[PDB]
Amino acid sequence: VNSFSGYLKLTDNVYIKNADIVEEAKKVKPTVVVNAANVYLKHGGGVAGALNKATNNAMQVESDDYIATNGPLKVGGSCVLSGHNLAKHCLHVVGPNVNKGEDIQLLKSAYENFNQHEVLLAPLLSAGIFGADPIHSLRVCVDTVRTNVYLAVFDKNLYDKLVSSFL
Ligand SMILES: O=C1CC[C@@H](c2ccccc2)N1Nc1ncnc2[nH]c(Br)cc12
């Protein structure tokens, strides 16, 4: 039993809700919140910009130190950093950005990072400003993640379409 509330159950382990991931994180304080990161951990917009703003830029300060020490992430890769006031940990995961021309096959590799954590609050990777089809992203999530994932979808119109079309 965990503290997530109001989710529709898609599969044994995948759940979905129309919610702002920022407000959901602030309420649940999950062990792991997933960020829709880029390789430079520059949290300027989309989910990343919103999560970082909610930390009063502390996520960005921590991220800049991480990059100065370790260099950029790989597309499809991840790193674990602090969750600040939102969660215990933030798993920064880099899905391919279609608006940069990156290989959508890397989306499965991106979701594989979730399997290192028993329970996660997460957005749909490569959706939104990353330019991929969110229906496809949900399919890859369901077919790749085996741990318990609670997906927050900000756009209500998109949420209804994802549910109505789910196989
Ligand atoms: O609906 C969706 C589906 C695609 C996803 C997204 C991911 C990265 C960049 C842009 C969009 N997205 N957006 C949010 N998903 C969850 N929580 C959110 N909070 C805010 Br603000 C936006 C937001």
Side-chain angles (χ1 to χ4, degrees), residues 33-103:
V33 66
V34 173
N35 182 32
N38 59 52
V39 300
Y40 307 110
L41 302 180
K42 287 171 61 90
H43 308 301
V47 167
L51 290 170
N52 177 59
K53 178 177 175 186
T55 76
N56 183 44
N57 211 49
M59 177 180 286
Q60 190 64 67
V61 171
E62 177 196 31
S63 293
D64 287 351
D65 171 83
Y66 173 91
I67 296 286
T69 297
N70 301 109
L73 296 182
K74 298 169 181 180
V75 178
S78 70
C79 67
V80 179
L81 291 172
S82 179
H84 300 277
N85 51 317
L86 303 176
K88 188 173 194 297
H89 303 107
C90 179
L91 181 69
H92 295 272
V93 180
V94 184
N97 189 323
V98 175
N99 304 319
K100 301 181 182 176
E102 292 165 355
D103 175 17

Side-chain angles (χ1 to χ4, degrees), residues 53-160:
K53 178 177 175 186
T55 76
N56 183 44
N57 211 49
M59 177 180 286
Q60 190 64 67
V61 171
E62 177 196 31
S63 293
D64 287 351
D65 171 83
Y66 173 91
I67 296 286
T69 297
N70 301 109
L73 296 182
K74 298 169 181 180
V75 178
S78 70
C79 67
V80 179
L81 291 172
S82 179
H84 300 277
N85 51 317
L86 303 176
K88 188 173 194 297
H89 303 107
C90 179
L91 181 69
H92 295 272
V93 180
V94 184
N97 189 323
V98 175
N99 304 319
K100 301 181 182 176
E102 292 165 355
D103 175 17
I104 193 63
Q105 298 300 129
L106 288 168
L107 185 55
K108 189 174 183 72
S109 302
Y111 274 118
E112 288 171 342
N113 296 286
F114 290 25
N115 289 321
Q116 301 293 318
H117 304 275
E118 285 190 2
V119 183
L120 316 85
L121 171 63
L124 284 170
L125 299 178
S126 298
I129 69 176
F130 280 63
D133 176 5
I135 298 179
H136 173 68
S137 182
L138 178 55
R139 187 75 257 164
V140 178
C141 180
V142 163
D143 292 342
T144 305
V145 183
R146 299 176 300 282
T147 54
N148 293 143
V149 57
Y150 290 83
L151 296 168
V153 176
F154 179 61
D155 191 82
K156 170 62 172 171
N157 285 323
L158 175 58
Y159 171 86
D160 287 348

